[PDB]
Structure formats: structure tokens, C-alpha cells
Design a protein around this ligand. Sequence first.
Ligand SMILES: CCCCCCCCCCCCCCCCCC(=O)OC[C@H](COP(=O)([O-])OCC[N+](C)(C)C)OC(=O)CCCCCCCCCCCCCCCCC
Ligand SMILES: CCCCCCCCCCCCCCCCCC(=O)OC[C@H](COP(=O)(O)OCCN)OC(=O)CCCCCCCCCCCCCCCCC
Lengths: 172, 345, 114, 70, 115, 83, 105, 96, 98, 318
Amino acid sequence: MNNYIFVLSSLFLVGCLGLALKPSPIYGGLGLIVSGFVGCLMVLGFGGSFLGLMVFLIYLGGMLVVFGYTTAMATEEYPETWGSNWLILGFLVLGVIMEVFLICVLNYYDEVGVINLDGLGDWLMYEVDDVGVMLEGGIGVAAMYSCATWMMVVAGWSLFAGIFIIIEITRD
Amino acid sequence: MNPITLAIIYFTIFLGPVITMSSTNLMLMWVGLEFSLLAIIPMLINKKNPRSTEAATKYFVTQATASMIILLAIVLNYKQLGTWMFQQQTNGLILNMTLMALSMKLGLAPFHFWLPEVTQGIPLHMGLILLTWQKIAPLSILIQIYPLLNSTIILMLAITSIFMGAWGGLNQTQMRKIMAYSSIAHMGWMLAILPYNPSLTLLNLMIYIILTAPMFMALMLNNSMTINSISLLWNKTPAMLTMISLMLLSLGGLPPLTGFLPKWIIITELMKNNCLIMATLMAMMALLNLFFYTRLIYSTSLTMFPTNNNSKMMTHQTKTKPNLMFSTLAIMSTMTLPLAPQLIT
Amino acid sequence: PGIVELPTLEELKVEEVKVSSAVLKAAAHHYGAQCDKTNKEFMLCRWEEKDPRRCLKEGKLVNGCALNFFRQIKSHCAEPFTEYWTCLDYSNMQLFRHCRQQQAKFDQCVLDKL
Amino acid sequence: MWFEILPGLAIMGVCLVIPGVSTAYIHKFTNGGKEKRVARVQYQWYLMERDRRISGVNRYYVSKGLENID
Amino acid sequence: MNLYTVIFINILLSLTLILVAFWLPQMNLYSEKANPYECGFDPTSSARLPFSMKFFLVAITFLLFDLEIALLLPLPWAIQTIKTSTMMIMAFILVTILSLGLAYEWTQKGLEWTE
Amino acid sequence: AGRISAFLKNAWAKEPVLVVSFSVWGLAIIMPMISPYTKYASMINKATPYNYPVPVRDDGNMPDVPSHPQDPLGPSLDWLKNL
Amino acid sequence: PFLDIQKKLGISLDRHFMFLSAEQPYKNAARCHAFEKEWIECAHGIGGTRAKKECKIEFDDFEECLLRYKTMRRMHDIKKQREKLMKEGKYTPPPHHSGREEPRP
Amino acid sequence: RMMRWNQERRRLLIEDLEARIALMPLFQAEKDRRTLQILRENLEEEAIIMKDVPNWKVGESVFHTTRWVPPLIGEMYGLRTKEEMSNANFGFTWYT
Amino acid sequence: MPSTFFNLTMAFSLSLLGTLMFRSHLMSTLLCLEGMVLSLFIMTSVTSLNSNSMSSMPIPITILVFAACEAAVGLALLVKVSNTYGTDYVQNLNLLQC
Amino acid sequence: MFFINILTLLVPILIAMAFLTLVERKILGYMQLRKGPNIVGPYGILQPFADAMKLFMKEPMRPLTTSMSLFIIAPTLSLTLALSLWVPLPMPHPLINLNLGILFILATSSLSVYSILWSGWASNSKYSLFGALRAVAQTISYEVTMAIILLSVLLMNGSYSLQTLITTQEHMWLLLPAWPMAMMWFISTLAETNRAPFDLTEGESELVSGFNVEYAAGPFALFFMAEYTNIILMNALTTIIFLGPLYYINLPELYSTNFMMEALLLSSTFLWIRASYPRFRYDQLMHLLWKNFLPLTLALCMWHISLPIFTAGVPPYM
Ligand SMILES: CCCCCCCCCCCCCCCCCC(=O)OC[C@H](COP(=O)([O-])OCC[N+](C)(C)C)OC(=O)CCCCCCCCCCCCCCCCC
Ligand SMILES: CCCCCCCCCCCCCCCCCC(=O)OC[C@H](COP(=O)(O)OCCN)OC(=O)CCCCCCCCCCCCCCCCC
């Protein structure tokens, strides 16, 4: 229960490795969905649930549209997965081996640098308000409605101008 | 484009760099960069040809990658220092990543490979909007963090920018590619003077903008995209040859044109900071830039290339295209050297 | 740098209130009304002197006032308060609105007495 | 007729009342005659942990009243 | 811990069901058994070919609208603010801008499907 | 105008969803500007005590703040109790 | 910023959440609020170069609070020495560090 | 009906928060006393463990300032059991 | 937290490496961009939750909003590329060299 | 004891799903002037067990063109997400008490859509591809509209928890203040659960079987269980949100009984609707949810932003 966050971070690294290795975009979207779920779990473990659930929902919608698009136009007769190419699968297992080697090197040589296996699970939650109401992560995002109205208006104008932009690009 | 979407797109194009320059927060500067990129893509792809589609795609992926590296630098600084500004003690790796990503957004060598290609295939007014307006916000971000940057990496980027711009402008015949390599060389000069005196960076930027604007307007008069196309300008608009020659010589940095002033004062400041080798190499590559400008002048003004038969009908027709702001910018970019102490601060 | 100076277990020893949260919430309003001055002194010293080691005397005074308050309740109003905190303890949130008859009887007892 | 549906409806009704009733009874049984405490905020979680420390049996639901006060 | 336990129990239950479904019945598979289904005839072409999408603009609009939803979702905590006038004005502006974008796309026939 | 009313009736007959949407939008815009309870929402949110009221050090110079919570001085919530 | 339109107009579009010790919702103090406040109070009015030279103590305290590098090193050294003493067997944990203690509220 | 019931709910929430406010000084005193006790026994254990380590100051702070720095969860539960550490880290998050 | 942040930084580095090392699929390049975005979001969110910076908690949502606008424009450009060529091949997007 | 609680949640939900299949057969038959199953068992009550046993003793299909990994992964994913969506519902006490319950519901529903999509793509068939693309369009439309609906309802409620919804409806149903968005939420749940007229993914007449046209036996059973568990799930969510059962602190059995009766009524309404109406065309579903529901949903969202402000009925945080 100490290395739970580290296991999640390693799974996120593996998912990003597969996404970098670039299979067919169906499998790329699958890896991105798994990475988004893992990142949601990481934000959940580190603190408020709202940011993790938000990025989860956003990436579910995004990879849904991506799946529709890759079935539309970014497809091939034989879609390429991680196991179809010997070079891609070799790069996958080599990246896993390199990750294990790098975390062992940072455990041994660098001592307490970025990775410490003895200190793992000790520095996840630094300071928490033991007694207290109004502490959850969604309240800051709510404070965007009051404290950062400039942030609110630039986000809203980004979405509005984006609607106009996509209409003009796909106007044809 | 209906006027509603014209107003929305042009207002967001304007608003991007304005937010970037006025923003205290690095995140708001970043979203200003996002505004500029997203708003300028549809006007790039507005003509809906395969070349415009390729140019828009290349520009999008390049600026998106560079903006992601910028966001990485911002998030790493926020992790290290807890604030949203590179104050004084941010990591040199973070600052170098910021510089590298902003140089890829600007389009200076060796990150320059997309800029002649994006400048090609888009209309001339969009090339003007790109090569003048799109560089102000990244330069503002670089200017805000001038004492923190690394002089070695900046000078290397600047010298390779001026070298590659000189060689590319030497090779190309397409006018948009020539202007893009000119942009690369002048961005190299601006980056070279950036860590020592950003006032000279702003001066060189303003001189380059007021020199680039009427050259693009004169190209926009007849849609002359080629050396030959600008070479038969004597039959079409004979009254513009002198101003074309003067503006190209000012771009070359020849005295007594006012375009000699940015190179002169940048060299002076580098000599004050004891970078004589860099200054001399930059000046020689600026001579190469002046060479391809002079070949352009030979093609369009000093000689007279053969004309066509339909140019008689084009002379029968009348035009109202050159606007009121062309001559003001041409004169202010040609004959303003005696006001050099006023142009500098 | 210099070493940190923090008090010992003998200085931190006090008669703690071995009283459950439902019991505390049942006696909450009268504890906030009767032991208000000592509690406000402790909060003032804590929010003026940020160091918690400068307020151990005030914390012990707060514990003593709470102990005296609960001893007075046990002396005079034991059974209505007992059933009141039991009925409060049944609820998962310990909502005051679920138990109002027991609250009324406890309030009547601590109004006619004390 | 239309009342032959009622056996399947009754089986569905029993299978839908079982989870909620059983969950309430299991919460009451595992928390000792009281509902399972909800800690939606850090204050409520701190109350639950304080009760767990106070009880002396490492169970928050064992409440201590005035019998611990002299 | 309890949520993780019940998620793992669901995973184990479904894996057990599919495992017993694959290892319990008798296997007899041949080429015509496992050929793809095209209503009794052979497929003319592979199903991995490009398959045109007539609501792609609506999908991009769905991306933008989903992010508008993400912006609107902290409202139940935003209504607890002291300055309710600023929150109310900002929420009204956001919903009105979203509605104007939808109306503009409806006017420009972006909601209609191509061909 | 008669033509405006005829257009409105035609819209209400044929496309009532948009008419209801625009009417609800207008009512949501104009209703807080005319309701007398609008200030009460902000006052309730201000009166909700999420944070501890940190006591102030009395130098004997401010007479307005109460010495005890059960004092006549201070922001009472009788308006909320009778609301 | 490159342009000071916010300072000229007196508005604060983004200047009020530039750091941890800025305005916070419901007065929830961020971590190292005191350290960052001390660093800004030191560095204000003297410029960046003098702030780097002379407020090094405040910056180092703030950085140590934020990243806790030395705290991690100290705790790792304590735990490594403890496990070495356990391996050579000349040390036993106290009861209150081994799970059985007398809890206090 | 929703307006009236929400106003009643607001009054009940204010009553609950006032009960929390009335109980808060005792909880604060108990919490800082417990934190000081845990830090004290950790300091004593550090004195026992690293008495033979050269150039080691027992209880040396990592801050130049002498004001109070509230200890981290890792500071006050580093030397205790892993189950107690996990309870301090993930207890509220994993209690559903 | 430091091991987690190092792993997130390496995840961003891998996604950037994937973006910089093209294969035939522009959609796969856009997916690598979205992976970079996801790593940035997780880093910002865990930094804000670790430092209790509720004032800076709107920043990850703003990152998601602008990045989704980026992805939307990328999908529109991929639509135009596929209408031009029939595929999303960056090897087909090459005729601007001369 | 927690494992026993898991069992007494999971097993009765599965039996209620199977008897929902039976009761759908009976109700559809009696609405179609016939009887439905009454031979297999006393009154047909052994028919779902017969169907389950037949499907789990029939051999599965592993087509040659089919991606085996995703073909296996999709149905178990669908069943796990159905049970996971069932887990946090309060009746009146949930097995897993969450703060952002409806956000968990939305995430798990979208992941179930992904299970359908991956099944359709893995089963390398053109009808499966049609089912996947129709699922994409359907979930686009209902996702945006249902998200705004739930946002407005919880703005009236005040928090994302569901015990808070019980406390909100302690005195009155939310159907009375929010009945237009209750109707739109009901249609959204129909489209989410892929029930007629918005099924469009297991298209019986348009396609052959759609996304599960290559699935046979066991995995097909898993898909059917996931779908009908989602039917009972979404109707239970609808009656928790809008038709608040009577809740008393001293006895929760009354709440469980009232919840059961209203959930049975809503499920029977689902079967009634399937009997009554013909199927939509899947572009008409998108046009409906984007041209009629969505503008009205935005207007009502603005109205529910304004309403507690000008009525001072801002809901409590807790
Ligand atoms: C859970 C609670 C109960 C929910 C209802 C459950 C029982 C009823 C179920 C019926 C069966 C449904 C099966 C699926 C049907 C699918 C078709 C369908 O519904 O299409 C939607 C139809 C669509 O109509 P249409 O498509 O025929 O219309 C044509 C539209 N054009 C031309 C643009 C294509 O209706 C709606 O969209 C209406 C949605 C509900 C609107 C409610 C408004 C109420 C009034 C608001 C306030 C008005 C006053 C404002 C203030 C004035 C002040 C002066
Ligand atoms: C076939 C493969 C299937 C892969 C996908 C599996 C999907 C599972 C079901 C859908 C999950 C959707 C995402 C849920 C994320 C967590 C939601 C949430 O809000 O959790 C918060 C909750 C407690 O937080 P809160 O509500 O704030 O309460 C604090 C005070 N009580 O609770 C917590 O904090 C607990 C944190 C952990 C919760 C998630 C546990 C997931 C377990 C791993 C599943 C996958 C295992 C790997 C694959 C196995 C082999 C196939």
C-alpha cells in the first residue's frame, strides 16, 4: 500500500511508451484511455477526485472521437499493433528493460535523488489539514468562477473561437 | 468567410499576442500563444489547395510540439519554485527548454526547416501576417526572461540562424521562400542581441517589420511569387522599382539606409560585450544576405526582363491596389538613418 | 542549523477527555457558550504565536475547562444528556435534526438547573 | 392473463429489496447498532479517528460517554 | 480499499464467466465456421477499409462542447461563493456563449450531415 | 406590431422548443434583477461559517465587537431565522 | 510582463494567483506560505540580482520547505541506520513505534 | 418548496458548523499536543539510534529559521509501522 | 512524490519522443501530442495537490481546454488531408519542398 | 462481512437481471396479445436459467479475421462496468459511499461505450463496424445532453453525492421542480442503455445484430447481462434522482421497498416503450438530441443557475 502510487506511475509510463511506439490508432487510443484511467487513479491517490474524474471523462470523449476518426480515415487493411512488428515489440521490451535498469540505477547510485525505494511510500502526502471543511480539489476549480474570471473568459473564448475555427477549416 | 467569422478569427489573431504581452502569468502567456496558433490556422488553410493544407498541417504540428515543450518548462518551474514565472533561480534546464521551444516557434535555425515551406503555399497577405505578427509574442516571452537565458546556446542558435538564412536566401527563387529566409536571418540577429540588450531586439524587430510590410505589399500588388514575376514589374508598375530597390538595400543593411542601423547597433553592443568573433561572422553572413537581395534587385530594377503581350492589356486596365500605408512604411524604412539616436534608446 | 526545542512527555501530560465525538457534538453548543473565554484565549495565542509550544498552558486550561463542564453535566443532567448523545450517535452524520425531543429535554434540564 | 407477469415481478422485487436492506443491516451489524459513519470531509474523518483512539479497542463505533469522566 | 476490492471481485467474476464459457463446451471449429459473416456470401472487401464519417464536424463540436461541460461542472461548488453576482454573471456568459456557438453552427449547417 | 405577433405565433406553433428556450433564457436573465431575495443568497453564503472565527486581541479601543458570543453585539442571523 | 496594461489600468487579471502565498479559497493556506511570504518580503524592492545574493537564506528555507530534499535525506539516514542496527541486532524498536501504544485524542 | 427546504437546510448546516466551531479549540489543543508527543518520541528514538554516527546532531533542523515548521506526515510517521503510515496517507481517501 | 514526478517526466519525454519520431500516421502523431498533454495535466494536478494550491487548481482545467481545442483543430486538418489524399500519410504531405 | 455485502449486492442484481429478461418476454407477449414463456418452469421462471445454461454450454466463436485480444476483452469489460456502476447506489445506504457519485457513473458509462466500440472493431465484420459507428454517434448526442441535464439537477441538489439527493427529496420529489429535464433525462437513459427507439447498435432489422453479430454463446451472454443490468441500473438511478422514495432514519426498509417499486415501474416503462415505438434513424437521434433537447437543456441550465440566486435557496455544501 506504499508502492501503490509508484506502480501506477510505472503503468502510466508503460502506456505512454506504447503510445510513443505508435500502433494502429485504435490501439493508440486504447493505450491513451488506459493511461488516462491510470492518471485519474494517480490524482485520486494524491488528492482530490475531481481533477482525475474530469481528465478521465475528457479523454473518454476525446478517444471516442479519435476512434471514429481512425475508423473513418486513418486506417489500413492490416492494422499494426505492438506484436505485428518484431522491431516494435523489441523496442517495447527494451523500453521496459531500460525502465527497470534506470530505476535500479537511481536506487543504487544516486541514493536519495528522484527515486528512493526505502523512502518510497513515505513522501506521498506531505501536509494535510486534519480538521477542516472546504478542502476538496473542486473548490478551486469553482473559484475559477469568482477568483479567476480572466481564466474563465479566456477558456470560454477559446471554445467559442474554436467552434468558428473548425467550421471554417472543414468548410471546404 | 462571412464577416462574423472574419471578425472572430481576426480578433483572436490580434488577441493572442496581446494577451501574451500583457500577461504576468506564464500560463496566460501560453494560452496567448495557443490563441495565436489556433486563430491563424484557418486563414492559412483558407485557400483550400493541397499546398495550403500541407502548410497548415506542418505549421500546426510544429507549433503544437513547441507549445507542449513550453508547457513542460512552465510546469517544471511551477514544481520547482511554486510560482508561475521564471523568477531568478529556476533551473537552467528549464530555461534552455523554454529557449529551444520558443526558437522552434519563432522559426530560427536549426528549427527553421518548416518556415520556408509554410511560407510557401499560403497567400502573400498570410505570409506577411505570419512573418510579422506571429513573432512578436515569442519575442516578448524571450525578452521577459532575458537575464536568465544562456548566452552560449543563444549565440549558437543565432549564428546558425544567420548562416542558414543566408544560404537559403541564396538558393531560393520563390519570393515567399526568400522572405522566409530573410526572416530567419533577422531573427538570428534579434536573438543574438537578446541577452545583452532587449531594447535592440525590439529595435531590430520594428525595423524588420516596417521593412517586411511594404515588400509584401509590393508583392501583393501583382501577386508576383517568382523572380521572373517580380522582374516584369517595369511593365506593370514602373513607379515602384526605386522603392523596391531601396527597401531591398535597406534589408541588406547598406548605409545610408535605415536598415543598416539595427545591424550596426547590434554589432556595437556585441563589441561592448566582447563577442568580436560572433559579430564578424554574423556580419559576413549578412553580406551573403545582401548578395541575394542584390541579385533580386538586378532581376527586378536595374535590368529589364522581357515582357508578355497581355501586359499591354494589363496596362490598359487601371489599379487602385497600393494603399495609403505603403508609402509611409517605405519612406520610414528607407530614409530614417539620421534619426538613429531617436530610434535607439 | 540549530536543533529544535520541543517539550517532553511530562510537559505534554494532561488529563485528556476520553469523550466520543457524538457526546462532544451533543454538548457542543453549551460547551461553546460556557467555556468560551478559555477557548478563545487559546485560539488567540495559537493564531498570534504560530508555534504550538508557546500555548501548552492555554491548551491545558482548555482541557480543564472541558473536564469541569462535563463533570458538571454528569453531576446534574446525566440521563437526558446520555439519551441525547445516544440518539445523536445513532445517525451517521450525527445530525441535530433527527433528535429534537431529546435535545429539548436536555436543554430544559440545563435551563431549569445551572 | 396479465397477472401471470406477477411471479416474475415478485422475484424481481425481492431481488431488488435484498441489496439495500442487507447493506443497511450489515452496516448496522458491523458498526454495532449504529449506521456506518460517513467521512465526507477531513473534519469528519478526524472525528472518526479520534473516536477510534478514544475507544481503546481500535474501533470507532465503541462510543464512550460520561463513564470515562470522573 | 473497499472500492478496489469490489472492482477486483467484478473483474474476477467476469473473467471466471468468460473462462468457463470458453473451456466448458465442446470445440469444433473449421474454416467455414470461423469465416466472417456477410449474410451468407463472401465479403467483397475487408472491413478494415476506410469507412466515411458524415458527422465528423459534429464530433469535433462534441469535443468542444464536452470541454464546455467540464467548465460548467464546478458550478455546485461555485454557487457557495460569497460573490454570487460575479459567479452568476460568469455562468450566464459561459452558457450564452455556448448557445451562440451552437446557434451559429446550426445556421451554417454544421449540424447537418454531409452528402 | 401585427407582423411581429404573427411571426411569434408561427414560431410558437411550428418550433415551440426554441420559443421555450429563448423565453427561459430571458426569464433567467431578468429574474434576479427584479427579485427581492437576490441579496439574501450572498448574505447566506457569507453567513455560512466554513472557517473558524479567529478572535481579535481587545485593546479596549473597539467597542463594537462582542466580548462573548451570547451578546447583543455582532451580526445576528434573525433575518435568516425568519427567512 | 512585456506590456504593463494591468498595472497602468490598476486591474489584476492574473496578478493575484502568481504564487503559493497568494489569495486562496476559504483561507486555506498553501504549503510553505510563511516561507514564501518571507522570501517575497525579503526580495521586494531590491531587484533580482540583490534578491539572489542577499535573500539566499529565505530562498533556501523556502526551497527546503517546498521540496524537502534534506528532510528526505535525514529520514533516509535515520531509517538506514535503524535497519542496520536491526540487522546486527543491537537495537529493538520501542512499543509505540511497533504498533502497540497508549493512544491519545 | 425547494426554496423553503434549501433555506432550512442552510440553517441546519450553519448549526452543524457552529457545533464544529465550538468543538474546534479542544481538537486543536489535543492535535498539537499529540503532534508534539509524537515528535518528542521520534526525537528520543533518533537519539537512541544514531548516537554512534559521527558528525550527527540529534534533532538538528533543516531550516535556517528558528520559527515553527509544522512536521510532515513523513516526518511524524516515518519511524512507525507501515500500516500506520498507510493509514495516515490513504486513510481518508480510501475510507468509503 | 519525487519518484512519481520523475516517472511522469519520463512519460512526457517518451510522448515527446514519439511526436518527434514520425511514423506514417498523422493520427498517431496527434495521439502522441495528447499523451504529452495528459502527462502535463497529471504533473500540474499532483503539484497543486501536493502544495495545496487551490488557487492554481484552475490551471490544469485550462490546460485541458486549450489542448482539446488543439486536438479539435488537428482533427479538422486531418480531415482536410484525408480529403486531399485518401490517407493521413505524412509521406503524402511532402510537396512543399519546391 | 464486506465480502458478504458484495455477494448480497451482486447476486440479487444478477437474478433481478435474469428475471428482467423473463418479465420483458412476458410483458412484450401480453402487449402483443400472446402469453410469453410459461412452460419452462411454473410460470416461465426457469426460462432465464435455461437460456443462460444453453448459452454457456454452446461453443464460442473465434473468427479468423477477428482480433482475439479485444474480442475477449470487450464483454468482460462490459459486465464489470455494469456491476461497477451498480456498486455506489444508495438504497438508502450504498455499498461504496462516494463523493462524486454521478461523475463515477458518467465515467463508467463512457467506458461501457468503449466496450461496445472495441467489440465492434475487434469482430472484423462490416455489420460490426456499422454498429460501432452508430454507437459513436449515439453516445456523442446523449453524452453532451445528459451531462448538461445532470449538471442542472445537481445544481438544484447542491452536491455530487447521492445520499444528498435522498436528503434533498426528503420532503418532495425533484420531478415537480425539474420535470422537463426529467423527461429529457429519461430519453437520455433510453439512448444510454440502447433501448428502443434508440437502440441502433444491436439493430435487428437495419443491421443483422450489429456490434455483437460475430459474438456467440458465452460472450454474447455477457453482453446481454451487461445491457439488462444497465437497464435496471439507469432506472434505479432515475428513481433515486427524480422520484425520491420515502426515507426515515429509524427504518430504511421503507426506502428500499419504495425504491424497488419505482424502479420496477420504470423498467416496465422501458419494456412498454420498446413495445410501443418504432426505431429511430440514427441521424435523427443526433438531430433530436442536438436541436431540440440541447437548446432547451442550456436554457434550463441557465434557469437553474439563476433560480437559487434569486430565491436564496442555495443548497448546502453538505
Ligand atoms: C423520469 C420521469 C418521467 C419521464 C417521462 C416518462 C414517460 C413518458 C415517455 C414517453 C415515451 C418516449 C419515447 C421516446 C420518444 C422520442 C421522441 C421525443 O421525445 O422527441 C422529443 C420531441 C421532439 O419534437 P419533434 O422532433 O416532433 O419536433 C419537431 C422539431 N423540429 C422541426 C426542429 C425537427 O419533443 C421535445 O424535444 C420536447 C422535450 C421536452 C420539452 C418540455 C417542455 C416543458 C415546458 C417548459 C416551460 C414552458 C413555459 C416557459 C415559461 C413561460 C412563461 C410565460
Ligand atoms: C478488464 C479490464 C478492466 C479495466 C478497467 C476497470 C474499470 C473499473 C470500473 C470503472 C472505474 C472508473 C474510475 C473510478 C476511479 C475512482 C472513482 C472515485 O471517485 O474514487 C474515489 C473513492 C473515494 O474517494 P471519495 O469519493 O473522495 O471519498 C473520500 C472519503 N470517503 O475511491 C478511492 O479513492 C479508491 C481508489 C481506487 C478505485 C479504483 C480501483 C480500480 C482497481 C483496478 C481495476 C483494474 C485492474 C487491472 C486489470 C486486471 C486484469 C484485467
